[model samples]
Target: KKIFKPEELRQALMPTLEALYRQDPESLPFRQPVDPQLLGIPDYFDIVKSPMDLSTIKRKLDTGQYQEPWQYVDDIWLMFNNAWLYNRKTSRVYKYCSKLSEVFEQEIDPVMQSLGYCCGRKLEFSPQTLCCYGKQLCTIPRDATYYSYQNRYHFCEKCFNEIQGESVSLGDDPSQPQTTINKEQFSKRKNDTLDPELFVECTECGRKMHQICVLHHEIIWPAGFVCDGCLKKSARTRKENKFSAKRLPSTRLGTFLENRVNDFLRRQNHPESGEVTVRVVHASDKTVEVKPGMKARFVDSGEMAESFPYRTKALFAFEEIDGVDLCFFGMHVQEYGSDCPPPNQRRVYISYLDSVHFFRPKCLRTAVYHEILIGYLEYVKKLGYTTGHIWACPPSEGDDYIFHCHPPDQKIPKPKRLQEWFKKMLDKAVSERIVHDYKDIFKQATEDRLTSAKELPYFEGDFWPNVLEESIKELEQEEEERKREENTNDLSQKLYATMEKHKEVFFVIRLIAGPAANSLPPIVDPDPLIPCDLMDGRDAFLTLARDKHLEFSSLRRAQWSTMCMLVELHTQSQD
Candidate 1:
């Protein structure tokens, strides 16, 4: 807010303000004149242009014609009224007048105090004694400011200035009919000025925020419109529970087993060997179907494959021996056509089994062994046994009481000992590094290896078998040649002797000494072509007969041809 027609009021207020200043020169609002001779024209006059006369008075004062040298008075008072003491909405100035006697009584003291020229803290004015509304914690009594934003919310002079500046329409809707609204209802509407419907207080935090701000973060309206701050806090609290519920690997595995086992049992409830105690091992593979039936193979010597007379249900079952634990391992296979590719098949595999501790420690026993044990315990529990004590306990020699536990008549509730044991085993496997972490298991299982990629067998239609046969035959021939060389003298020594013996065989040697015989050595005796091991007059080659198979010239040529063919075959195979 600014004084209306400031330019017009300038002439009237100038002489009147000067008269007030002269009456009480020592007052807080009035002060002695600034000597322009010492400080020159005031610096503010250069930037801030006031409506009052200044230059005319300054010129008179410089010539010593004017008695008073305080033309800067109007400039200082103009700022006080416009910026400091002015009221918003109604353009009226505060601190219009001050009396010396009223200051002790505190009636006129507030005019200057509201302008913050006097010490208010000495009267015990602090935030605790005031009210918290906007920025300035407005003090009580004399300089008190109040608002209905939060039911009689108060503010001090400093905050009131900003509130007036920022809050246009004064925290209210001017278009709304003021006559129909009562004081209380109007106060509530003014508290949230943007719109009555668009703003609400957060039920959790009890703070007012616009509905647009709440909805901007994409959170649905709460039961009572909680603010984002409270929503974020609640989300953090639930995060721990949410993560645990989603990530419990063993529990999910157990649940999977529970459903599948129940399905299998319901389909075929009774075994042929009625009420038999047996351990079942469930296994599966995607590449091939495992034959269903027990087929024994020798530990070191004997081997045979035989199929037993059984379908899917009663594939293999045997009586539990008195002193030995009985177990059944089952393998399930599902075929994939070209439509189901390798990557998709791997994903299915991970979904079904990777979450569990499938691999066993040290022995490299397949996942079947672990599942079989778990399935057996599950089966016993379903049979109304309190615990799998028969499976849990070490086998005893007694024949009569081998599978005897609490009899069917007792009908005790299952203690779930086996379930606990299975969970513990899974935990132990993870800790011992026998099984991979559940998170990494899928990636490790599905990701392809460079070594495996190179080693993959190359397909050559139906001719691949014949190509493999040829490769084997060539390898056998090479092995035989190597063995023959080892059985005779070393290949290098034999070559050396044969070269010396066939010095006459070389045309270059014969051309140098044609039909010339020397008892003592010839000028260039070819007998020393190959060096002799023992000290002798004759060279090493001269001692051997020129046999074709052992001859150095033939052997070297044959070996080179064999090596070249082998290398060519290897290169072709790679291509």
Candidate 2:
């Protein structure tokens, strides 16, 4: 058995990673973190707790994050675990996880055995632990001895000393230290994440039914026994009180089938699926790795084509075409500074339109985006979403610096081309007479000045969903006061120290940027509150990105990609 010193482990891990990356081209998707920048799935990080990938695995190995052999191997398993958690059974990327899982197991075993870690890839959240078995509100550190166990239930000192408790279900110890709770219990917990069937469970008959099945139907919050579509060709849907209202209709309908298929595959002992068949539609001679310009590079290299954002949305019409990710356009009916208070309004945001510069055939590029746009408009139109807003902005460049040699400007790049590409395509589509009902709502170049703060977005910290413009000035003015006051204050004046001494509990974690392209130093909140675990990194990140981190993200010289679309769904489907 080899002693796993930093250098020793580093020596072995480096070569193993090189081989893994060299193996099947399926490695493309799993090589990096999933983000809005590359992988389009927004709630993915919410569902998948920790993201691990080959690129990250290598980075950690180089930096000595792997103290033991299993740490490195665990990351590989996490990479698979995330894929299994995200992608469905019949979906193409699920097949990638299965095949790659076997390949790693084969290659990693001997190396793991060398370091005396035969039981590799098993889920291990922590090594040794346990004192506090607490509830959601318990702020006690897990190791503190104040907590006590009652039967299977764990309690912190606060709860153990005569308080109400939720009898901890043995089935869902997501962070259990013991290996006994891995398979069945963990598996059953996921059952609730995916519902039994039907788009919704009907309160009337107590049976789940698809919208079409129950023709004459009406939605009852935490309730749905309705389908306005059959009687009137429009989907008269209103926002629900539930978080389901936040998720678009496509996100809800699409995920159920995927989760159902994924649950089926999870049952098999060695679950596996098909591989991607590479058929270059418009074979290009250009193989040089480059961004955009429809180079044969994007299609053939397998580097750029198989990105995450392009892959997440599984298209019904294009099932087996794994190489071609048809998910360019996203749909949602969200707060965009409107007059209505987000109740009866069906104004859908086309959200964002993105295209992969890598491996995409130049000829079919517009065709793919247009198809998704049509599909989104058609789906929302059927659901009676009146208008669709398009945030006509290009992908603010930070990640692109890595693939192409780093552009000197480390700050956020301008989205001029992004806005142009979106506008030109949209205008051309309208002019070409393919689709109807669209034209400039606010021209990219407004009569307003180039750096007009009045018309800008309130994307910094607090997003004012209903009133978009007021939020711009709200953040703009609030920040000036906050910044102007900081230099003199310098953690003195004892305003917070007195509050802390008087049992006003507070905790502050160090601020360092994680999983960003330009590992820029983080800006700390002068007096941040670590309130109920309700607020996560994203919440603080919201405050950081627009408010501070992206002090320059909006500094792009060109008019941005946030373009609005008045999708007149009612007129088109008024049959």
Candidate 3:
């Protein structure tokens, strides 16, 4: 209905008009030789009788469908008809531009050169027309010069349409995507040769630029837009340039080592199934040392226990994602499978990637599961197993992403006041034990033996004392016995009659010999002594000396023997 303000008209109304002209050529108002007599001059005093055509109104409505405040189609058609008096091509450019050639100079084409202009006027006409146009200010006929009046002033719509048809598609296919992160391929690509195709020229400043910049910006051949350097500086001057970095896990150390162990066992297995799964259950509650050959038990119910496996392929079922092969180089202490009574059972740990703060070397029972898993991974790798290729996408990685948890099944108790109390108690007891052990072992060792009179603690005071005497063979024997007791490896828990019989005989021998070795004095024995007559007692005191890091069941047997000995000693004194 009305002319828009200068800025509003350009930004809002102009683009819609250009789009309409591109879509349909018939919407343009003027064509061919002189039509001045039919023109409607704006603000003229001449009496205007007939209105413009309904077809013009129809075309205006057709182009007006584009959302806008840019409503000026009818006015533009009026301008085009008036330009029809001067030249048909100029009228056409004016029609598409929605202004007369003189007026369009003010409406558009100051900062950005329009693609339509190449045909609106030939290249030769641009210099004079651009000058007379003078930075988008529409000019009057009085300003026209003969130098700007040439046959090359503007071309008709037919040639403009042809140029539009021949335009090339640019860019790589976004659908056929690649990560650019193939470790091997990317490495080789870095060393590959780079070749240049074409030189670039800036349209505005008439300066040279890189062809790569043209490609990046999708500049069509004979580009209408200028290079970035030719244009005013943009606010976004820098590319991201740096990718975020991700670090590997600390919890993975244990998993990595454990997988290595599995590998070693698979390769170097002896006549028996040499692939051993060594699992460690950390100490919880007040358990200091369990007796030798004793199984871990139900702490509250006093029920006998089961064996922890060192290796298990089936475990992947729970840890793996979507049945895919998942392998870890190693894992660290992750808490799981502890069947503590309700409220206190749940335990949590930092996963491998997050375990960057492990400063202590001391093995806490709470760390047993993670330690065992680490050992297994180590063993597996030693046997030359590889999870990298077979399991590029570990279920653990997916599980971690999905749940943000290391051991997905690891139950974490909600932190309530009750849990906080239990945690405090546990920490206090463990800390106390740690301090006591260090004081006794380290304090005595550092003292002067001659002056102090107290014997200096030696290698025995160190962690894992007498480790040399307890070889893998001894561990295997102990493990076998445990497996038999638990009926592990999918076997029944009942021991064979022969094993039961041997166990009975061994008990008799221990009862007769008391706590001493056959050649040694009972008084010098570190284990509490047992008497033959009272060997069957249920509650016996057992001296769990040496490295008392065993399960409680191991000490319970010896306690029975020692209680028997007390009975015998009391009877002997009375006689």
Top-lDDT structure, candidate number: 2
lDDT of 3: 0.27
The residue-by-residue lDDT of candidate 3 on 465-505, one tens digit each, is 13212322365687788988996511111222222332211
**How does model 2 score by TM-score?**
0.25
* Candidate 3 or 2, higher TM-score: 2
Ten-residue region with minimum lDDT total, candidate 3: 118-127
Each prediction's whole-model lDDT (CA) = 0.28, 0.37, 0.27
- Give Cα distance to truth, residue 392, candidate 2, Å: 1.5
Angstrom error of the Cα, residue 440, model 3: value is: 46
Give the alpha carbon lDDT tens digit for every residue of 39-93 in model 2. Answer: 6667787887677788888889887777666567667777888788787889877
Note the clash tally of each candidate: 6, 18, 59
RMSD of each: 42.1, 26.1, 35.8
Indicate the residue-level lDDT of 138 in model 1: 38
Better of 2 and 3 by lDDT: 2
- Residue 564, candidate 2: alpha-carbon lDDT: 6
Question: Which 10 consecutive positions of candidate 2 have the poorest summed lDDT?
Answer: 557-566
C-alpha RMSD in Å of predicted model 2 compared with the true structure: 26.1
